[PDB]
Amino acid sequence: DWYVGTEWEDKNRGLAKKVIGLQFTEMDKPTIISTVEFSVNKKATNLGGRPSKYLVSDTYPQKHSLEMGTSLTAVDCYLELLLQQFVPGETAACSITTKTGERIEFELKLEKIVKNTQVEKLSAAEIYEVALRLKESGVATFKTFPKFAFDYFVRAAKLLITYKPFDKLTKKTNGINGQAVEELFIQIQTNLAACLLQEKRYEHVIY
């Protein structure tokens, strides 16, 4: 065994991964816009009341379909980032450390990558739909997780400005009308503004 025991970290986000098993098929990793299938191998420990679509218990192991950039909770969003570090067939002990130092611990396996689209490949039309879905997740997490909501809108905005100017876009050439793009960009800018106000409203409310 070579891959077993190897480790990855993102100190900034309190994420750590340690490989415990591998059924090798290839060294491909999920992209930021991929669709994957993965399983939770046992009950997550120390969830501590935090909402999670995948880790929240109520039989193991259990399978899930996941499209990157759709998660609506803090834990789930960070689940995605861990999954983006798996190769298919890999089983890893994962952890999310909180501000209080307490660790949420879980064991995941990436079963396969259903679709591994690359951003660079995408047409302007397809980029729009990715920006549109990201904004939707932003809107859906606005009340419950404003920092993540914010990050969503930022990600959506960043995708779109790759096509500035917008005035040179036509359905005929790019697949999409440049008017639709600048309208969606403006909606996102407005959402980021709202988010900052939402964060202010609760900065002095304790966790």
CATH number of 166's domain: 1.20.58.80
The residue among 51, 81, 116 that closes a domain is: 116
Name the β-bridge partners of 63: 39
Written as six digits, the tokens of 177 are 């009308």
Which of 98, 116, 134 corresponds to the end of one domain?
116
71 with 131, same domain: the answer is no
Same-domain pairing of 136 and 177: yes
* Contact status, residue 93 vs residue 18, Cβ threshold 8 Å: yes
Residue 148 CB: number of other CB atoms within 10 A? 20
Same domain for 136 and 66, yes or no, is no
The residue among 188, 203, 130, 129 whose CA lies nearest residue 157 is: 188
Domain that holds residue 179: 117-207
Q: Are residues 165 and 95 in the same domain?
A: no
Looking at residue 101, what DSSP letter applies?
Answer: S
- 122: Cα within 13 Å, side-chain hemisphere: 22
Q: What was the experiment behind these coordinates?
A: X-ray
Burial of 100 (0-12, 13-18, 19+ CB in 10 A): exposed
Residue 96 near residue 75, CB atoms below 8 Å:
yes
> Which residue matches tokens 């990201």?
134
137 Cβ neighbours under 8 A, 6+ residues apart: 69, 70, 71, 72, 149, 152
Rounded to whole angstroms, the Cα distance separating 20 from 140 reads 35
How many other CB atoms sit within 10 Å of the CB of residue 169? 22
- Residue 51 is given by DSSP the state -
Please check whether residue 181 is in contact with residue 174, taking contact to mean a CB–CB distance below 8 angstroms: no
Is the Cβ–Cβ distance between 162 and 181 less than 8 Å?
no
113, burial (CB in 10 Å: exposed 0-12, middle 13-18, buried 19+): buried
CA separation, residue 179 to residues 97, 170, 184, 185 (Å): 43, 9, 9, 10
How many domains does the chain fold into? 2
Is-contact 169 177, C-beta < 8 A? yes
Statement to judge: residues 42 and 139 lie in one domain: no
Report the run of H or E that residue 114 belongs to, with start and end: strand 103-115
- Within this chain, do residues 2 and 91 fall inside the same structural domain, yes or no? yes
The angle at the Cα of 86, spanning 71 to 102, to the nearest 5 degrees, equals: 65
Burial of 3-23, coded b for 16+ CB within 10 Å and e otherwise, reads eeeeeeeeeeebbbbebeebe
